[PDB]
Amino acid sequence: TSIMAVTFKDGVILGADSRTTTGAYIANRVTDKLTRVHDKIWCCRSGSAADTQAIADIVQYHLELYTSQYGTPSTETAASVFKELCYENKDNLTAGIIVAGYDDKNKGEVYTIPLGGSVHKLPYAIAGSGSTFIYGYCDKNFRENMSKEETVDFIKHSLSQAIKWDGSSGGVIRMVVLTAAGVERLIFYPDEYEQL
Amino acid sequence: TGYDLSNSVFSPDGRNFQVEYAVKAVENGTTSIGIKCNDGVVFAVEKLITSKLLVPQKNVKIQVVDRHIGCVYSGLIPDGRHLVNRGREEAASFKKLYKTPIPIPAFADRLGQYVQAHTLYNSVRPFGVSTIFGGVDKNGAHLYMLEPSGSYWGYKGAATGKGRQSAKAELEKLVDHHPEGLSAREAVKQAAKIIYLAHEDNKEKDFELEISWCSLSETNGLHKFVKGDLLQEAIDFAQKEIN
Amino acid sequence: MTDRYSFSLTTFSPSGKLGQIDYALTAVKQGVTSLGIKATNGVVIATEKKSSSPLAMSETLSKVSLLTPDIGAVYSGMGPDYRVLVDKSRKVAHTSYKRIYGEYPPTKLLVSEVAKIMQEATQSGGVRPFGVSLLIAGHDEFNGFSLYQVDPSGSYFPWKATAIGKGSVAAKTFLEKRWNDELELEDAIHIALLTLKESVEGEFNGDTIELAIIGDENPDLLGYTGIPTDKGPRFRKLTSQEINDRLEAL
Amino acid sequence: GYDRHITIFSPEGRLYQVEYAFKATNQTNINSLAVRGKDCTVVISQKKVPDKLLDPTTVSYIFCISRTIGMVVNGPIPDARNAALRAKAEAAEFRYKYGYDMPCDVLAKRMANLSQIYTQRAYMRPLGVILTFVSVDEELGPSIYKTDPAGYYVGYKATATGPKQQEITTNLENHFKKSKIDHINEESWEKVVEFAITHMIDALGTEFSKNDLEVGVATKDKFFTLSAENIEERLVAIAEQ
Amino acid sequence: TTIVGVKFNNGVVIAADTRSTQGPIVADKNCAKLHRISPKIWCAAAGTAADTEAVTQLIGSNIELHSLYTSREPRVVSALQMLKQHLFKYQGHIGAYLIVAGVDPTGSHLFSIHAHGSTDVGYYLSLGSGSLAAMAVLESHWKQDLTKEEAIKLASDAIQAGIWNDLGSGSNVDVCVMEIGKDAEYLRNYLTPNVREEKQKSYKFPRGTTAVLKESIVNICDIQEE
Amino acid sequence: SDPSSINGGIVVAMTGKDCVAIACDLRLGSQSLGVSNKFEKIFHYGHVFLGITGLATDVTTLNEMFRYKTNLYKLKEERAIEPETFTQLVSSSLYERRFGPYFVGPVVAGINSKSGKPFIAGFDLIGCIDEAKDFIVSGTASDQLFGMCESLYEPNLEPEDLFETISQALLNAADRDALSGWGAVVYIIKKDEVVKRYLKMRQD
Amino acid sequence: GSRRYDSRTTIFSPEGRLYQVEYALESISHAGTAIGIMASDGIVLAAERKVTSTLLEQDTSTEKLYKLNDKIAVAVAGLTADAEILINTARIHAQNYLKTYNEDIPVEILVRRLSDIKQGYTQHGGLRPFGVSFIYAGYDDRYGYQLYTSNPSGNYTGWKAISVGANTSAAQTLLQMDYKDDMKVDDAIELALKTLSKTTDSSALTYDRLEFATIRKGANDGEVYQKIFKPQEIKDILVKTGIT
Amino acid sequence: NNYDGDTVTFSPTGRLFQVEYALEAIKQGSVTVGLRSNTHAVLVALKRNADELSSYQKKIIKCDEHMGLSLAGLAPDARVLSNYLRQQCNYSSLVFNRKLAVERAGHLLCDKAQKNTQSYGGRPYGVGLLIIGYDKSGAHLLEFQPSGNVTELYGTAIGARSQGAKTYLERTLDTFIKIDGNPDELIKAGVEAISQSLRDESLTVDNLSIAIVGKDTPFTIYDGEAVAKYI
């Protein structure tokens, strides 16, 4: 798995590869690892497929019930609910989750939640097995307040490299754009991103 | 008849007489008020000096919930404390799960549902307090008042206890004469005046004034007690207006 | 915040009466008429759709309920009590039978389970009895067609034909004259419509009458093909049009 | 006479506590109405703010239960809020367990089953409320389902609740007798709201300002309440024809 | 086991081989692995045989009660949600690996679910020991906008690949077709490419060949009258 | 250590023309030590026959359990349980001990009294059903029984022919297993008569 | 609180009686009569149905006579639904005993257990008692043929012949008059039907009004057979004895 | 009348009669006085005997080194509540290494008493308490009533004829508050205060019970010949 979320001028963009593995067999080559927990709060999933689905389903439930009572939850609140589940059930879970969302007040925000269940607010985040190969690249090429086109290219080039070197990552590059304008889904096929 | 002997029994009217009897305990208590201002809220209460032996400024009645919500009540004082203790548990579990401090409307319903639950069974007694509470959240200032039935609404100004009619009249004048709004420092002065004017209903024993406030500009959106020079300035303003 | 009612609310009075059961039976008497008739090749159950308002959509309120594919139920008395009993009856058919034996219970044993639930509301702590009488019609392989009545006490009896609720005394007399052991299902439907017309005041048509049968297997209603042994539900609710057709030959 | 204090049968086969809960329903002295369009379901209710010290924005008897389901209550606000919180929790739990949005009629059934339990179990009192649930259901289309303290529920072409319910009911009955259809044949929800307000004005015989009404609208995939200014726009259009 | 699912124009088809094993021995040559959850929701099972049966029957029972409660025809997403939460709770110990398909008022659907409780969406899927052989065929011949006839053909070919090349799979091909606006058609033993040849010899014995010590009638009847 | 092979033993069942046969060996041991030569493994509840191999304490426990359940069934239903229904009851009862199972290999055999149809079934220890047309095998010599049955069996055998086939399948399978044998019993079951035969076999 | 509405079902009166037990017995006195008669070669159970309607399906009906196991049966007087709760418990107890000891339960042990359950409802739990009286007819290899009765108090006693339900005073006088120790089953059948025929509140005793059963050690080769009589078989025995 | 059967029932004028009846048990109890200065806090208690052969019932209970109370009413209820205070003082020490504030001790007693007034089955506490202590904000005196109401005071008295001592303290307020660094003079003022509530009987050696806590003084109880000095 290779996943990332990147804040930019107009909001935040989430990105992921589409590979699911059983040993060295690719169980699913067109996986969707970008999952909606609220209208404009999404997450990138890595680790156990079962665990991250179970967690994400519970978080979606908690935020739906939050919305009914208190109105739209903040991205920080969504991250806190993820954290609570990951921290308290750390002994029984294998989940590495990036939470990304758009408010009008706070604009684009990214929170990363690694294995222990700690929370870390960051301008961008990378995770999954394939992320190890792009720490160097991402640190050198990330700038704050990038444009939409620049941020799409940054994620496309980054995950392209993660896919190239990690056997556990591959397939298509899926992205989800979160701005005031709404929610846009993007897809990029091997013939496009391999030749970069 | 017999419909008033047990809590949660509907009378033929469709009324719960035990709740209406709890309201009488509230009406018997000392006067307490709330004033919504431009960027916050002000709370004030009448403390009856039963004896010279009471230590001044020590028997504090107004209570804080979390760091941003103030609570005051009239009626059975222990019932009010029980409700605030629950309010503190509700605010803590909200902050634990969701990170952000509990919004005031959210907090209002937590108290409301808990008070309402004490009208559902004969094994419990209704609350013998009406509670005025509020503070500052992300959406601004909010003032609420909650009755023994579990009923609550938002308010521009609120009052309960023995001097409530007197206080309600004074609050209604402020709403008419200040449509653009009232400042936080103004609301403290006016709160002192209203408690002093409402004291004519409890005029036998002399009393002690106690004020608190939350304001975005004056207290950084945190609940604080009015103390020292600012308290004395409000007492002097109140003493001048009655004379 | 405690349930302190751990004691019986139904007790014996000096005369030997269980008051709450009698009073529940009185609530059943006030309820709308429903009936059941058993034929040689089927069973019919029927009742009036007493609409509380003409703005209300009476199609949404189902007085006649499927319990299993071969068992159906109708009532007289308190509608909400009936609705929760239908929920519990459907569930107990699975939990205490289908999940053990891999097949639906026979009519008499499902009746027995419903009866048990109603008995318990007549003895357990802090509850009143159910304010309904049920008529349960069904089929199973070894007992054939059957029709049962269940009362607030938990008592149940098998019937060739009967009626319960408002005009049950008159309706039972009407059925005694018309019923014989050589009736076909169509004859029983005809007799059910005649009997029910006497207890209805206002409009009498497919939209104000609710009628269902336990009859032949309906493979067209099954929803799938490929298993010869699964031949379809014997329970079928008659449509508004199907009722009106038989009212012309009445 | 302890058969009138708890939910056990009287000698007549009656539950007096259920009947008295029905009377608590009208304690607020508010009338509500619900109608169905082609693409929508509209619910209107009277709004009365007697005290000048009240914040009028917080005074409401319409609740957003889920994204698709709205609920208007006739009855005291504590019991209304009790019912609202439970319905919200039940709607969310349903989505989590079964993977799709709780239908309006199913939520109505669930809340009615809970109300039934309070009529059978002694330690719990009935809630003194009538709950009118509205949505545009993805299978059944525009939907109105109403629950009461007896645990009774049914679907409706249109409905009305409150002290003057019968006057509203007959007004609506007479309209549907003319048109010979189960709904308001109208494309936009705006005109269906205008119909609802107009027929309440005719039935009650009172005029309404922007602050005297409260409106809820269900469309496909959302339920929302109108602001005072949105209602004013509705009132202007009624007056101009 | 080899099980597959394939989406088409107006529905979805599932298929399975008919072999069940106990160690290296074939326990049943004509096993039925296509389980009906509800009339139009069916699923193919692989893994621990008792677990797949128990899990389909439990969720099928609760789906039936849910359908009666809501007055609505059951949805595939509901069967999926109930199956995954049950399997997650048991942390993989319930060894059920399933392909869940069906038609409902929302449309046609195809999912897979694994024993630990993860699910996936796809136009074509395979599970069991023969899933690699089946997926090879699916990855070579699948296209968008398949007809009913093309999808049945592709699904059975994918099972055949499992039958011939995987020692875990064998015998016959079972198919179930679920088309929108139609009854689901279960095709038991849709292909039979593994009939045993006639034996060379008859092994019927002469009567009296086996040595007997004692004979007796067994009373199977109840206690008699008179 | 392995509970399924402490005591030893086998059961086999076969269908014929308007008949079924079920058979078992008589050995009970503690690994190498032969203890009993009278330990029968076939029981009956009305007209439904149940054979059970595996851990002997569980064989006895499950016999007593299904006697209990089929007695209550009969009182409530007012009829004897049928083979198809009993099969489901066995499966339900085994699977409820999913994570602490009975270490057994049950085999159901009988004729449905209404349809007259011959019926056999087998199960694993957690209750999975194998409903075979031809034959069912169980026990420590199951491999051996599978081989014998798969070669010796032909469909539609008359009762007296089916006796010879099932007996030879059992005997020759038992003689290739250390923990089976020590005697054998064969039930021939027809719609309204059941014959039980003890077989002469080698006593080692 | 809830104390206000508690009837207090498990208290003594000033005279030392259990109110609810006494009132339950009053309920049972209105139920249809059931008679048990024990002979040297068998037991008879006869009972009168309460709800005469021509439209009642009799051949599939069971309100009075229930089977507990192959050796033991009961006749019911009182609330049928209450009785069925107890019957199913007794059926389970019998099978628990069979599972444990591999022997059919002795009659007294089953009777004691059910009677202890009834007793419990009179001493604790605050619930109403079961409004049921049973006649137990059974056989075991210790005492042979046995008749018992139990009532809502949980007290049980053994009998040569006994009645429960309606008109027991009248019924017990008639049985005490005509019963003898050397009596046989065929004679006991006649006595049971003659006693019901005189005590009945109905105009005449007919086949559609009766449930009838026998427990004989007159089965093939010294076993015990429970015969629950069919409607036609009750009609035949009514003609044979000379009542219709 | 009809509204006094249990603690869960309000009367039509909003009163809780069971709580008021519990309050009555305090008035029947023997007199006890509390007072304080800035440095010290004193309890004085008139102990009651059953007859001349009996002992005099102990009125004062130690809760911690820096806190204790005197009782009036049902003594077993004072034992339950003082045990609770002992535990809460102890919890504060073990978990936070912190001597429990006297004001916070009062809040805990209030909330414990309250729960018994709102739930069915239970009864209110039938005792009143005077808690003295010295903490980080100096000397303190509290009055506890079993309604839940707890009050901080310079001085007070509870029990039979307690109004006499309470009036004296109301006059003496300005004098005794200034008795700093002089424990014997503060006790004298307490003994003179309790004397205003006496009729017929006078203060003997085994009748009187005194306790004191202060700046460099642990909570200590004086009985017997230790109080002969003050008679």
Ligand SMILES: *C[C@@](C)(O)[C@](*)(O)[C@H](CC(C)C)NC(=O)[C@H](Cc1ccccc1)NC(=O)[C@H](CC(C)C)NC(=O)[C@H](CCc1ccccc1)NC(=O)CN1CCOCC1
């Ligand atoms: C590809 C990636 C970089 O790992 C990325 O994180 C993705 C993200 C998902 C799609 C959200 N993760 C996977 O693909 C996981 C990787 C993983 C494997 C094992 C433990 C943790 C993570 N793959 C799965 O979760 C896989 C999905 C199935 C195929 C639908 N599940 C398994 O492989 C299953 C997990 C068991 C498990 C669960 C939790 C902790 C530890 C173990 N494992 C097996 O089935 C093992 N397999 C081994 C080979 O023989 C067959 C059995």
Ligand SMILES: *C[C@@](C)(O)[C@](*)(O)[C@H](CC(C)C)NC(=O)[C@H](Cc1ccccc1)NC(=O)[C@H](CC(C)C)NC(=O)[C@H](CCc1ccccc1)NC(=O)CN1CCOCC1
């Ligand atoms: C065959 C296949 C290609 O793998 C395909 O997935 C099928 C699909 C089924 C029919 C839906 N799977 C099987 O046939 C399984 C394969 C399997 C075996 C063992 C573990 C997991 C999977 N077969 C069975 O489940 C088999 C069915 C019987 C033959 C009817 N059962 C067993 O082999 C049984 C499993 C026991 C078990 C217990 C706990 C956890 C998991 C499994 N094992 C035995 O019977 C072994 N032994 C027990 C003691 O007596 C002697 C035999």
Ligand SMILES: [Cl-]
């Ligand atoms: Cl429900």
Ligand SMILES: [Mg+2]
């Ligand atoms: Mg790669």
Ligand SMILES: [Mg+2]
């Ligand atoms: Mg109730």
Ligand SMILES: [Mg+2]
């Ligand atoms: Mg051997």
Ligand SMILES: [Mg+2]
């Ligand atoms: Mg040997």
